[PDB]
Design a binder for this molecule. Sequence first.
Ligand SMILES: [Mg+2]
Ligand SMILES: [Mg+2]
Lengths: 48, 96, 134, 134
Amino acid sequence: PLNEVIERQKQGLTSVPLENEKGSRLLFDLSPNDLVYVPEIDENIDSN
Amino acid sequence: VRVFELGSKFQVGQTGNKKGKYVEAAKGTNLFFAVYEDEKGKRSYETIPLNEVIERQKQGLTSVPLENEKGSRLLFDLSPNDLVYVPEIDENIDSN
Amino acid sequence: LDKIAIDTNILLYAYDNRDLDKQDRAVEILLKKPFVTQLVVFEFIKVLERRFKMDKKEITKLTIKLLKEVIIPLSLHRDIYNYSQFLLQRYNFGLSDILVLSDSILNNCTILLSEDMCNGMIVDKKLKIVNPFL
Amino acid sequence: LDKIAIDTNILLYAYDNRDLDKQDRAVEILLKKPFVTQLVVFEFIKVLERRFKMDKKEITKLTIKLLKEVIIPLSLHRDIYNYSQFLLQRYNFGLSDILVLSDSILNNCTILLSEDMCNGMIVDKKLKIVNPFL
DNA sequence: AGACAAAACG
RNA sequence: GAGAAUGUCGGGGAGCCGAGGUUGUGAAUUGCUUUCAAAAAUUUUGAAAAGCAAUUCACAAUAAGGAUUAUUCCGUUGUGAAAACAUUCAAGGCGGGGCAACUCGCCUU
DNA sequence: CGTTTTGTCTCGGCTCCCCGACATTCTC
Ligand SMILES: [Mg+2]
Ligand SMILES: [Mg+2]
């Protein structure tokens, strides 16, 4: 939510938390007009 | 005739055909019962399977993990014949 | 009613007996199961192994004992570095002290106990340092 | 296929340019997004502030930079101290190195990159140290 | 036969 | 009350072996379900595949696991932090036993 | 979710040490 982003940016922190409740590490955040690449089904893009 | 049952049975082992053998915990082997609490104050409970305890103790670690998947710090673990005190409904036993 | 954290110096004064009164005070704090930050634990380990030369085995055993029965370690917060950079502009302390305060605040700690941090100073309107030995 | 971690010395050799070949090698490692342990980060901060006297602001900014884009910090494992005590009986290293190895293994790290750890030695049949600069 | 561990039933 | 000898009734520990059962691999035969895939009048018949099995046979594992190449083994017992133990534990010599390995006694520290 | 119900490896031979309880005789 925009509100949480407001507090996080006020505190000098990143807009998106780097870890969720389960502790899963943040892969990345997407915003409108951002560009992403979808690899082919066979492609294995881990460190491409 | 082969009668089936729906439940949670773990493999006996991992080598050869031992993966194909599914068994249930032996009587009186649920020796550990972990109680965690999240920052909010809510309690979470779990029962540690014997094999997990065996592996943890072999690694020199405590029988019960000190945190759950959600990250709730472990309050304490209970075992049979352990003694607990239940505070009165009004009582607030935090550091009694 | 107020989450309380500690710094290395409290546990050191507990471990040291040259000063009976201060050791007593520090042990008195520990009776309250105060919270603590993992960096405090690591710094305690370093000081134990350098100043006191205690054995690795004994230091590890005491760390485990204290963390199991007396105090409560605080999970490291992934926002520690960004917040520390945020605190550095407004605050001029040792980066180690800034990291300790950052993690303490990020865990909602309301009181931090330490001496060498300009006692009574409030950090970002969230945590007031308390000097207990006075 | 094999989780890879690093020690402070790799990032130091990256930060140091006196040795072009070794700096190059260390930077080459960093192109692979190697994992790392938070204690490595803290020790890096200390060495940066003591040997190099760099500013707190600059060191914090570079730490954030690297942790954001190049490397991946490893969440501190609560079983680090118990395992370290377990490792101490069979292994005689610096308690700091033992802690680093403990956390690396507890995170399923398969390769640790460092020099001052008796290269090629296997720690509890789970992680082989690799000396890359040779 | 006994009492635990978990399916099964509401 | 203690001991020695002789009987009766019980209890404990250890050891050398045996027969199934279960799960899984393969095969012979027959089934149920689904899908394909045809023929025929939504229904009937036929081939193939997958799931589940039955009867019978050979084989693998049988506390997870860890040793070892001796015709050896340790893994559900008790004590309690030392993750350490108990449940094997000296040296000779003088003999009996054997196809010998190995087994049973006597003598002195 | 809170409660009750259900299912849980099974049978054969033989040997050799130990211990205790009870009876008999006698001695100290
Ligand atoms: Mg300090
Ligand atoms: Mg080091």
